[PDB]
Design an enzyme around this catalytic site. Structure first.
Site, short mmCIF file in Angstrom:
data_model
loop_
_atom_site.label_atom_id
_atom_site.label_comp_id
_atom_site.label_asym_id
_atom_site.label_seq_id
_atom_site.Cartn_x
_atom_site.Cartn_y
_atom_site.Cartn_z
N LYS A 21 0.77 -1.25 0.00
CA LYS A 21 0.00 0.00 0.00
C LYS A 21 0.80 1.29 0.00
O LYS A 21 0.33 2.32 0.50
CB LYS A 21 -0.97 0.00 1.19
CG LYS A 21 -1.68 -1.34 1.41
CD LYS A 21 -2.23 -1.92 0.11
CE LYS A 21 -3.24 -0.98 -0.55
NZ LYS A 21 -3.67 -1.50 -1.89
N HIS A 52 6.89 -7.23 -2.79
CA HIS A 52 6.79 -6.51 -1.52
C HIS A 52 7.81 -7.12 -0.55
O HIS A 52 7.78 -6.84 0.65
CB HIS A 52 5.40 -6.65 -0.89
CG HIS A 52 4.30 -6.04 -1.70
ND1 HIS A 52 4.30 -4.71 -2.08
CD2 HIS A 52 3.13 -6.55 -2.14
CE1 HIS A 52 3.17 -4.44 -2.72
NE2 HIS A 52 2.44 -5.54 -2.76
N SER A 58 -4.20 2.83 4.55
CA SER A 58 -4.43 2.19 3.27
C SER A 58 -4.50 0.67 3.41
O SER A 58 -5.33 0.01 2.78
CB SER A 58 -3.32 2.57 2.29
OG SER A 58 -3.59 2.08 0.98
#
Ligand SMILES: Nc1ncnc2c1ncn2[C@@H]1O[C@H](COP(=O)(O)O)[C@@H](OP(=O)(O)O)[C@H]1O
Ligand SMILES: Nc1ncnc2c1ncn2[C@@H]1O[C@H](COP(=O)(O)O)[C@@H](OP(=O)(O)O)[C@H]1O
Ligand SMILES: Oc1c(Cl)cc(-c2cc(Cl)c(O)c(Cl)c2)cc1Cl
Ligand SMILES: Oc1c(Cl)cc(-c2cc(Cl)c(O)c(Cl)c2)cc1Cl
EC number: 2.8.2.4
Lengths: 290, 285
Positions: free
Chosen positions: B45, B100, B130
Site C-alpha cells: 500500500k 513486496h 491504506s
C-alpha cells in the site's frame, strides 16, 4: 438525521430543547422559588451528579444513610424535566420541603425569574468542551429521547454549532461566567474537582456556610469518588429501566476522567475543533484545561 | 479473535505471509532473474500500482494504448503471488517485476545479476490506513479489527510482509547504491514531474516533454481510478470487493489524520521514534 433532530428537539426562548420539556414550559417559566433554594446549574454532562452528591452530603452533615433514602434524581429534582406524567421536576420541587436543592442545565437567560428575584445561591459547574462532547455523545446513545447521534465527528459538528439540547456550550459557560463574578454564584470546574477534590469540597462547605471538619471532608471525599458513586444505585441511575437509560450500551458513570477526548477525537477533528473553539472563546477570560 | 486473525497467515523466514503464497515459496526463492529485469519493490500500500504504471509508460515510450493491452497485474507480475513466477518465467525481456519482499528475502538471483531496483516507500501512518481498508476489502485477509487494534498489529509487524520499520530501513541501506532507486510516495505527490524525470534518467531513457506530459496525465489518481487496466476492477467482488472500499481509495498524503485519534497518534509516534531514530531515513506525514 436532521429529521431525527427535528422530531426530538424544539426551541424555547431560542434554545434547542428536549421536546417533552418544551410542551409544559409554562410550568418552568412560572416556577416559584424559595429564598433558601440552592440551584446547581451545569451544561449537560459536566459533572452535575458529582457536585450534586457533594452538596447533598454537606446538607446532611455527611450522613451517608440520609443520602440514600431515595435516588439522586428524586432527592435533587431536575427543574425543567418533564415527560407528561412520567417525570415532573416542577411537581417534585413544589411538594418538596425546604431546603430544596434544584438541578438545572438552563443558561442564565432561561432560569426562572423567581430564582433571581429571591436571590437564591447558585453553584455552576463546567467542564472542558472536548470531554463534554464525548460524554454527551454516549449520553445520546444510551438515553431515550435523543436522535441517533451518528458518528462522533458528525455529533461534534452539531456540538460546535450548538445544535444539541441546551444550545451552545460556548454561550452557556460564558454567560454563567459573567454571573459567576457574583458572591452568590460559585463558579466551579470539573477539572479542579479532579485535581484537588479536597480544596473544592472545602470551598463548597464555606459557600454553603457550614463547618469544614476533617472527618466530614474525608467522608465526602471517598463517598463522592467515581468508583463509589459508580457502584451506588442511589447515584448511578441504574434504577431506571433500560428503555429509559440503557446502561448496557453505555453506563451513566462512564469513565469519570479528564482527557478522554484524546481517545475519541481524530487528529483532524481535533484541529478543526480547536480552530472553531478559539474563535468562539478568544474574547473571554474564562480558561479551561483539557 | 487472534486465532481467526493468524489463521489466514503463515510465517516465512520470520515474516507473516498470506498462507497461499507460502505453499509455493520454494519457487520464489529459486526464481531465475535476468540481467535486464527491473524490480519494483514496496511495502504493501505504498503506491506500487502508481509507480508501476509510470515505469510501464516509460518502457512503452508513453504509448497509452500499449499500457492497456492487459491489466497491470499481468503486465507487471506480482513475483511471490500464487501465479507470478509462472507469468515471469513465460515472459519476454525486459521484464518488470513487482514485489513486496524485504531485501533479505528477494530471490538471490536478482542480487547475483545486480538487477536495477526501484523501491518506493510511504509514511507509516498513511500506509497503515491504506492497508486497513485493504484488509476489509480484499479476500485472504482476516477482519483487521478496529482501527486502533489494526494499528497495534502494524506497530508489531503482525501483518503481511512484517515490520514496515524493518522493511524500509533495510531497503534504505540498499538504496545507498546507485543501482537501487529509493523513492517516496510523498515526493511523487508533491512534484510528480521531478520524480518522473528522475525515473526516466534512472531507466536510461531519453526524456522529452511529450513523454513527461503523457506520463503525468495518464498516471494521475483520477485517470488510474477510472482505468480498468489499473484499478483492479476486473477482479470479481469475491476476490476484491471494491464496493466496501475501492483500490484507488483517496490517493492523498495525510489521510492518517482522519483516522488516528490524538491518543493513538501519540502512542504511534512514541513507538515510531524507538524504531526509527537511529536511521538516516527521513519521511514526511
Ligand atoms: N464522582 C465522580 N467523579 C468523576 N466523574 C464523575 C463522577 N460522577 C459522575 N462523573 C462523570 O460526570 C459525567 C456525567 O455528568 P452529569 O452528571 O452532568 O450528567 C460522566 O462523565 P464521562 O461520561 O466522561 O465519564 C460521569 O462519569
Ligand atoms: N495515481 C495515483 N496517485 C496517487 N495515489 C495513488 C495512485 N494510484 C494508486 N494510489 C494509491 O496507492 C495506494 C495503493 O498502493 P499499492 O499500489 O502499493 O497497493 C492507495 O492509497 P490510499 O488507500 O491511501 O488511497 C491508492 O489510492
Ligand atoms: O442531565 C440529564 C439530561 Cl440533560 C437529560 C435527561 C433526559 C432523560 C430522558 Cl430518559 C428523556 O426522555 C429526556 Cl427527554 C431527557 C436526563 C438527565 Cl439526568
Ligand atoms: O499488493 C497486493 C498484496 Cl500485498 C496482496 C494481494 C492479495 C489479494 C487477494 Cl484477493 C488474496 O487472496 C491475497 Cl492472499 C493477496 C494483492 C495485491 Cl495487489
Amino acid at each position: 438525521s436532521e429529521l431525527d433532530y427535528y422530531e426530538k428537539f424544539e426551541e424555547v426562548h431560542g434554545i434547542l430543547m428536549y421536546k417533552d420539556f418544551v410542551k409544559y414550559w409554562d410550568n418552568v417559566e412560572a416556577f416559584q422559588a424559595r429564598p433558601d433554594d440552592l440551584v446547581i446549574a451545569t451544561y449537560p454532562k459536566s459533572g452535575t451528579t458529582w457536585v450534586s452528591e457533594i452538596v447533598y452530603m454537606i446538607y446532611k452533615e455527611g450522613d451517608v444513610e440520609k443520602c440514600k433514602e431515595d435516588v439522586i434524581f428524586n432527592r435533587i429534582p431536575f427543574l425543567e424535566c418533564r415527560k407528561e406524567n412520567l417525570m415532573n421536576g416542577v411537581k417534585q420541587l413544589d411538594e418538596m420541603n425546604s431546603p430544596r436543592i434544584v438541578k438545572t442545565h438552563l443558561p442564565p437567560e432561561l432560569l426562572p425569574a423567581s430564582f433571581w428575584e429571591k436571590d437564591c445561591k447558585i453553584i455552576y459547574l463546567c467542564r472542558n468542551a472536548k470531554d463534554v462532547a464525548v460524554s454527551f455523545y454516549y449520553f445520546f446513545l444510551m438515553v431515550a429521547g435523543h436522535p441517533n447521534p451518528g458518528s462522533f465527528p458528525e455529533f461534534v459538528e452539531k456540538f460546535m454549532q450548538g445544535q444539541v439540547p441546551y444550545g451552545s456550550w460556548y454561550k452557556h459557560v460564558k454567560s454563567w461566567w459573567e454571573k459567576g463574578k457574583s458572591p452568590r454564584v460559585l463558579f466551579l470546574f470539573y477539572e479542579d474537582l479532579k485535581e484537588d477534590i479536597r480544596k473544592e469540597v472545602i470551598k463548597l462547605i464555606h459557600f454553603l456556610e457550614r463547618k469544614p471538619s476533617e472527618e466530614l471532608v474525608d467522608r465526602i471525599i471517598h463517598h463522592t469518588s467515581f468508583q463509589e458513586m459508580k457502584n451506588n444505585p442511589s447515584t448511578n441511575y441504574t434504577t431506571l429501566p433500560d428503555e429509559i437509560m440503557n446502561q448496557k450500551l453505555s453506563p451513566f458513570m462512564r469513565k469519570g476522567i479528564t482527557g478522554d477526548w484524546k481517545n475519541h477525537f481524530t487528529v483532524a477533528l481535533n484541529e478543526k475543533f480547536d480552530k472553531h473553539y478559539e474563535q468562539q472563546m478568544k474574547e473571554s477570560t474564562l480558561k479551561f484545561r483539557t
